[PDB]
């Protein structure tokens, strides 16, 4: 390879520690990421230089606090190829961004004759919501079945969709199963009867280049922390016309043009979705986040996570005895697995035993479990920073757990 | 016999120039600096502890829960709730307010109840209760406050009834420095089966908080106007209505089990917690309580208050500018107009002289058309300015005047 891992695993301060006697190997990405010191060093910055509050400000730090917030959105536009920063909202997360979708277009405006259409792939943040909305308004939460290797079935899907679709909520990538959708047919196939489209961007967004005016999805959401950035900060992208047209979700200062008791005016978007002070320094924290990423460039980090992908993927079929569960032809660097008799958690304590962090459980997608017909699996999900000599233990780690259970 | 100058040495932003000025930092009510301990504690676990929190195997994410889970409990004790169940981390008091209006008014209103606030609350106690009278029927009443910047008390316990479902009182005023006397209002909202929420979001830097002894049934602060990091806040409830209340956002983290068919939501605090949490921003916060208390909240509210009087009278003595807010008790914010300056060339000029206050309407539009007014100009005090400071700040206020003789 020509990626330089080992210059990039520099930037990572949190990779070069100890587990007990262990060398760290992080392998639970697709939970959280670790994050380069351009993105510590802008948080502090932050606070340490020019901390204050954003907008209807006088003084100098105020003034250059608000620059730099909107200079955030205005990068965040910037990598998701929006039309405009004020279609780019800032929120906790991917849950929040979706809750807020639910509850501010679809549960006003849903009719009881009335369906919402999800995949079984979907994360629990892009499933409760819609049951919220769908217990309250009596509408119907559909699901388009996957197959046994980890692909939505496109023919169903289109099945499915039908003039009472009126949203549809769909995974881009997968963080259990690294199944990554083909969202631009999908959202296609979903205005083709008149249907608002949902992407759930929260892992596509750390692996690929995303592009919302070419996949001319209706919204798009992700986490920061997933994507190298600090927690507590996200994003809900979606068409002007749209938020524009839906009523506010939270309630309070800076959401307003004017209060009085006789009246309220809201605030245009971006600012009509973001009630109160906002994370300041979460916002300035993804986009110095946004500007590591490109430094090592999307089609670079691409190149060399699947070639970590394809390494692992042999590798841990070469060790006997582990069945992948999602084998998709396009994934991001996620290997969910089972054993038929060794436990998942079994499998990740033992690995955590050697240094080695995976998560075994059911990735907040309890259907998919249900679907596989196990009650957890094994997952190892990689990043830029994951190197093949980690792989090449992390495989030797768990010949050792067969070893326990021999 | 406080040492701020010591004190002062643990902020590094005070320590700037504004042009050849230095920064004089009276805008703490729009949101406060941070001591190195934040700072340091944020960074210290970017480097060294982050991971995701709950159900984790592995060393980082059962490190990282603990920091998490024993951040709670430190607001627990800090806010002297009964137990960490209780205390639910949002992005602020705006989040928090409209979680129990969607999660335990706006399921249960009928139209013509009625919800009860004062004049003085700050829009994020206003605006989501106009949503649930818009959409539920019910109807918005509004205690009075006289000239001073005081609740008129009778008047708040006329405006209560039987029909009054839910009182949500502001505790400090972020515009005229007013500490309002919340227990007693509880009390006369509980006489008629009121529950009550406190906004806490200027109270909670000033002074020591008992959300047991006020009685007050949900309490709500921000951690950015305490010397916390941005982004994070808590909205404390009493377990059994927290417990009979419908969940707010739904997604991974807050439900225990998810098919189609079924889904059961998981028990307080994390019923309430929907996706990852900002769980650096309460990692930072639990430094922030272990900051103000190495500083004692009693020795803080001893300083504050000389800061306070200092200025009030300086204020007073400079001519021409007339206190909005005069009220007995006081968080140290003194709100001020001039009958023929401008409160946005007050702002302007002080800030080319390094002083950042605030002018505008604070949020608060209500309490300025009450006061007949567009604006005031606001300066809000921490315990790491200095009656040096005020004393440049009314010099400069002084000069202001020259301006437009
Ligand atoms: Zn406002
Ligand atoms: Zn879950």
Redesign the interface.
């Known amino acids: 390879t020509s990626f330089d891992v080992n210059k990039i695993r520099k930037d990572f301060?949190?990779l070069h520690?100890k587990?007990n006697e262990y060398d760290?190997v992080?392998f639970?990405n697709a939970?959280?990421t670790?994050?380069p010191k351009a993105?510590?060093d802008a948080?502090?910055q932050f606070?340490?230089?020019?901390?204050?509050?954003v907008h209807?400000?006088?003084?100098?730090?105020?003034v250059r606090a608000t620059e730099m917030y909107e200079a955030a959105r205005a990068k965040v536009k910037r990598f998701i190829n929006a039309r405009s920063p004020r279609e780019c909202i800032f929120v906790?997360?991917?849950?929040?961004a979706?809750?807020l979708v639910?509850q501010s277009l679809v549960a006003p405006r849903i009719l009881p004759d009335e369906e919402i259409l999800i995949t079984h792939m979907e994360?629990?943040?892009?499933?409760?919501?819609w049951?919220?909305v769908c217990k309250k308004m009596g509408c119907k939460?559909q699901?388009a079945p996957i197959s046994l290797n980890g692909e939505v079935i496109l023919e169903e899907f289109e099945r499915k969709l039908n003039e009472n679709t009126k949203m549809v909520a769909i995974n881009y990538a997968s963080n259990s199963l690294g199944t990554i959708n083909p969202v631009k047919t999908m959202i296609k196939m979903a205005h083709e009867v008149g249907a608002k489209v949902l992407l759930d961007g929260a892992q596509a967004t750390a692996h690929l280049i995303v592009d919302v005016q070419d996949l001319d999805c209706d919204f798009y959401a992700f986490?920061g922390?997933k994507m190298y950035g600090?927690?507590?900060?996200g994003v809900l992208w979606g068409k002007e016309e749209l938020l524009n047209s839906m009523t506010?979700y939270?309630?309070?200062?800076?959401?307003?043009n004017?209060?009085?008791?006789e009246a309220?005016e809201y605030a245009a978007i971006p600012h009509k979705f973001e009630?109160?002070?906002?994370?300041?320094?979460?916002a300035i924290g993804l986009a110095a986040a946004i500007d590591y990423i490109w430094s090592l460039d999307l089609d670079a980090i691409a190149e060399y996570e699947t070639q970590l992908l394809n390494y692992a993927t042999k590798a841990i079929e070469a060790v006997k005895g582990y069945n992948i569960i999602g084998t998709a032809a396009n994934k991001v660097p996620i290997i969910s697995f089972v054993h038929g008799k060794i436990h998942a958690?079994d499998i990740?304590?033992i690995?955590?035993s050697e240094?080695?962090?995976?998560?075994?459980?059911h990735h907040?997608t309890?259907?998919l479990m249900?679907f596989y017909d196990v009650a957890a699996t094994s997952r190892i999900s990689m990043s830029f920073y994951n190197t093949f000599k980690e792989i090449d233990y992390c495989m030797e780690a768990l010949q050792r757990v067969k070893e326990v259970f021999a």
């Open positions: 301060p949190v520690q587990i760290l992080y639970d939970a959280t670790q994050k993105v510590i948080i502090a606070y340490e230089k020019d901390n204050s509050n209807r400000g006088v003084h100098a730090l105020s906790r997360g991917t849950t929040e979706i809750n639910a994360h629990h943040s892009n499933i409760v919501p049951q919220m939460l699901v986490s922390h600090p927690t507590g900060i506010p939270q309630g309070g200062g800076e959401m307003i004017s209060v009085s008791f309220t009630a109160g002070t906002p994370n300041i320094a979460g958690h990740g304590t690995l955590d240094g080695i962090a995976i998560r075994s459980g907040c309890m259907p249900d």
